[PDB]
């Protein structure tokens, strides 16, 4: 097959779908891909190294020219002319959220698979649980940041130094996002206290950091005091916390949500944290998109109907929306994806 | 040499001051230990262990009659009368809080010398620390007990469970006892917050916990705020908490001093922690000790004049009160040791 | 929906079954909440917390009085009057350990969940769990204050100290109990041995302390090792330990049950553990409860209808006996809980 | 004593040289305190909280009047007028960096006394340990945040994400600040190696931290490995590395030498790290300082002739050039600060 | 100066006394280095290596002419005809344990350096640490080894596995060989006890440990109980254990004596354990080694009389013997270093 790699555009972005490691595998495999010059200079992967990896660097045009596109982001309109019925798009979409392209694609007859829409038999996404990971690893680390006085926060280090104590760094949510913010928080020195409402999902967490990190159960009384001590404040669910409770926190108290200032607290709303760091967002991406792309290359569409999971992760075939919730969304016809797939 | 292990007396003390182990090792030299019976039973140690380490088991008074005499606390006057020139008494002797006894030895001849006043170069008392090390470990544990709503505190769980938050326990001195302390505290735990002057020892107390357990420097400030959250303080050095921050104490906290209520505040008074432990006491000790009664063992007096430390550990002598701290204490007649010794 | 909070009346029982902050909760939504007065000393929690929460602090018969009436232990005779058909009584009812609180409930026609019986899918009593946990956690503490020679014990500490050796705790089990007495055990420096009979809960307990603990599998020849050389033997189970093998433990050593003197050895049977700790467990068991407690206000005995866990927590209900199981011990019509409830 | 705080007008400087418990303690010793208004709003500590603790907010001639004024940076030219001789003044000087302040400060008469050469008998420097530790810790987290892409960075997190790699941090020194980067580079997930000359202090370090940390001897083929495969590089000693070793830094790769960009690799050169964590770093500075203040407020310079450690700190007085350094670095008259004191 | 590298011609010895960085090192500050072909083969360095790094590759006489000589190893009978009076020679001697060797230098009226003399003010012998530490490494590694049944041990793995206890290590000694031994024992999941006389080093070891490790007062009770028990055990000092003891160990257990079979026991009777890991060895070794050979090339001998630890080093100069304890062995005239240099 014929695997095109395009230049992300979306502003900032700097993850690409491919790397050269991936593009060897596939090479060494008989197929053939297209690298868009640049493609991955925003991870540090230079046209040079996809070269030796055996693809081909060409242009923009050159690789939507393949049967299969791997993409991060989602397609902008100023790309909505590359959509096609016989190709086959495989990267972010989140059709749900802008109608704009549900539309341009389906009138494009292309099959586009979204990476959020694969899903485990447990539910789990694993092509979008990497990104929950970073994220996490990144919240207590753009916290920090901010409490810095230069940056207007409290002006305070998580660990403090021997002698001074440490701050206090409090997280609601006991998920992939909240664990993974914990380590990090916990290895800077705060004192970490993380919420959640289930009880196993503590139990689990007191047993993996021994005693070190608090766990509360998620009440509101919980929430309310843990939120009034919290020098760095992290998000991680998705009405929780209200304007009410935000005057309660210490002036110079910073907030970061996963999923300005305020009362003298300053929030921090800058989305895709792991946009920070493209290189490694993008080795988390793509060694969980590789195994995908490698058996789509390999049966094509036969790949979708050999794996339930794969599977749901179409949402656009000839026209026909394979995905219930952009259905229900946007009040359009839902058209179960195997039935879709077999016509 | 004769050697005689008298029982403790003094009400309550069950420590015996000579093993089944210590027995062997210096009968395995050719000495004659003479263990009054039921020496160790305080301890766990049956007659028969010591029969079979080649002790003989003997009365009170028998004891008493060996060239040296090993015992774990100070001559009661019960026993005055068993002092004698030749005697060498090694045992706790705590003489400048007790003149009768100093007025009962000196005028007996007898020649005593106290684990307490055994000095190395570097200042430390290694026949003493061992009771620091067992005192600070039993703090927290004495303090969680206390913390049982029925012994009339408030009723909490130094660890909390998984949901609820853990206790504060708060540490005031960074020496033996309050290191020992911390280690336990954490253990069972507790949010460990521990207070100090030296700043060395803050942060080689940062090194052995890695960030476990809060260091704070030992300001007046820092003592206030601390002392006021604290669910157990203990204090470990011997003025720094008044009667008025007690005020400060959420009621039901208790107070271990190693060094009744009052505002709410339930404090533990009763000295010798390491009595409730005997056994391991005992071993502490006596694990400490044996090395010097083997060496007077072997030496007699000379063991002191070839251990410049064993040395400092000689009160009296002869009629001759040898320890500086008890003279001054007296207002009494300080002879050199070394000088005592020879004449 | 008005909610009845009495006081515990069964003696030495200092839990409170709503917290102020469960209050405010319930009252922000709307509701109306009545707490006897004192009802939450025996927890530290004071008439005026409950009062600035929202409660309106009544007496013991008007609590009595309210819609749903949350206690945490369950009706003693002299209460048996309160107990009517409209009524929903939510506690620990222990039906199949007590006929005539059985009989004079469903003589009364009251609707009561235990809960001890709600249950979740796996098969898990999430309501019960919190007191495993504080159980556990005690467990270790309560078996090193026996372990003082003072309280009849061996006389040694479970952690030793430098140069002395630990004590060794075996703990049968791995559940619950067995889990969280062994983090408190390892915390307080035993040499910690746990013995289950399933394998995989020995290599998620190797995992979880790296291998800070000795996991045995539970074969006979095991426990009876671990037995004989136990300084501290902790029951976390239910005959898996015959008074045979009693006379095989060292004199001085302990054990606790968590399901006076024998052979040397001192038995700690003493109830209700998480009750010396009244003020954690309440917390712990309030924190689990109430969302449940919400759910009922919220949606009366429909909360039933629409959770699977929460139906099986319904014992009685207009004198039908719910419970499968309390009716084959007194051998009395089992009538299912959505049945019932639904006529 | 009426000891004087001014307001820190270096730009940037956000620390000050007194806390309100500080001057709680003076003033609780008879002294008076005349703070300036704003001092402390840089570091979070507003005129009211210095005024509850007793102290006279004042303008900034009335603080430089005081018998003894504390600050944190030396005197700008703009401050030389409020030099005079009975003045004692307690700061950073930083003299032999600074000849026109030397000299200001000689000829105006004043008594100066430096933090940085307060120097205890096995060498340490106190005074100015507390910042190396704050700058220590703040090392990694500033570098982390120029690994990010949109700084310019390589754009990678140090310690990745499940299934990928973290980074590599290596560290020049495991002095204060390298022991106190490393606690923070392993604690956010990095491949952490620490370089020394000192091997006892590589074995210390090793013990510490386990073994999770490599130590590495520095040598001259070991600091060019580390250098040449370095994602961030931490500088803490004080020609260690040439520009040459540069080139075989990977690009994108980070330099923060605590003692732009060039070859692909970005330099952080932004003095004052502990001054971003303002807060944290004032209680770390006076926490340390504030003893020395008390002992300068009751005893005056008879303080310095009390105790060895602090009179190493005088650098001027009534005109004499009372440091080696300093005076052999200038090439002035130098003049035992013992001596000078009694003349 | 000219520098020379002979290879080690002793059998089985395979370390290196110079590496190529140290070569580079030397030959960048202008000396000019002669290695013998295939020097460091025995460590994985092969000759074009060093001849990269700068050095001459030459034959053994060649290497001997140098004016320095660096080796691993003391002189063979079949070497002493390189020694000369200009000659300075700087390696193991060992020469307390070899007359021949001591006679033969002081006839040639060469100046032989001993690493394992150079002393530092504390007593450490700082270029013997080195092997100390690969030395404890490896001991628990050969332990395990033996330990296997093929090579006629008891059979079992030093940790065992989830369900199976672990097996016992005891070491007997808290140094440098004891410390690190512990660290590896400990790492295979061994329970470890390390036994010492000094309760500092116990004190401190019980820092670095948590409580992982057991410690015990080297008491000749704790000994024999411990050699009692031991599955596997190592000496790390110098008749601590007699053939007696050895009685009591099961059969199978095997010793490692870092300082054939009998009654059961496996005795491993090895000498350089370092030397199953020369090339580890080599660069532990040369690394403490490389900075005082940079001092000695710089400087010749006033390197010694700079530098006190150095000085201690030596031990023959133009036929003067001046190490004292080695002069006392033999009984021959000492001259002291000092002395002997200046002259």
Redesign the interface.
Same mark, same amino acid.
């Given at each position: 097959m014929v695997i095109g790699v395009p230049k992300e555009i979306k502003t900032?972005e700097?993850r690409v779908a491919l790397t050269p490691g991936g593009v060897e595998s596939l090479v060494r495999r008989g197929h053939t891909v297209l690298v868009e010059r640049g493609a991955g200079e925003?991870?540090?992967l230079s046209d040079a190294e996809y070269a030796r990896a055996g693809a081909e660097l060409v242009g923009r045009e050159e690789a939507w020219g393949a049967e299969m596109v791997v993409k991060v982001k989602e397609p902008l309109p100023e790309e909505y002319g590359f959509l096609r019925e016989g190709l086959i798009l495989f990267t972010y979409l989140h059709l749900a959220a802008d109608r704009g392209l549900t539309e341009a694609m389906l009138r494009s007859g292309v099959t586009g698979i979204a990476y959020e829409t694969v899903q485990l038999p447990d539910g789990t996404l694993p092509l979008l649980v990497?990104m929950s990971?970073?994220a996490g690893?990144?919240a207590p680390?753009v916290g920090?940041?901010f409490?810095?006085?230069?940056k207007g926060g409290?002006?305070?280090?998580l660990?403090?130094?021997? #002698?001074?104590? $440490?701050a206090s760094v409090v997280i609601l949510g006991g998920g992939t996002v909240g664990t993974?913010a914990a380590?990090?928080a916990?290895?800077?020195?705060a004192?970490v206290?993380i919420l959640d409402?289930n009880?196993?999902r503590?139990?689990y967490?007191?047993?993996?950091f021994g005693?070190?990190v608090?766990?509360?159960?998620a009440?509101?009384?919980?929430i309310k005091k843990s939120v009034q001590h919290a020098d760095l404040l992290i998000g991680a669910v998705l009405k929780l916390v209200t304007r009410d409770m935000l005057s309660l926190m210490k002036?110079?108290a910073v907030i970061v949500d996963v999923a300005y200032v305020v009362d003298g607290v300053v929030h921090y709303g800058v989305a895709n944290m792991p #946009?920070?760091? $493209?290189?490694?967002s993008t080795?988390?991406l793509t060694?969980?998109t590789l195994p995908y792309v490698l058996k789509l290359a390999e049966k094509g569409l036969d790949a979708l109907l050999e794996d339930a999971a794969l599977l749901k992760g179409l949402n656009t075939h000839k026209g026909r929306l394979t995905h219930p919730g952009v259905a229900e969304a946007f009040g359009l016809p839902y058209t179960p994806p195997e039935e879709a797939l077999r016509g």
């Open positions: 900032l700097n925003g991870s540090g990497p990971e970073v690893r990144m680390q920090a940041q409490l810095e006085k230069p409290r002006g305070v280090l660990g403090g130094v021997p #002698g001074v104590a $440490p993974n380590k990090i916990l290895g800077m020195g004192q206290t409402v009880h196993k503590l139990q967490l007191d047993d993996v005693g070190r608090i766990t509360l159960t009440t509101e009384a919980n002036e110079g #946009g920070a760091v $493209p290189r490694t080795f988390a060694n969980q």
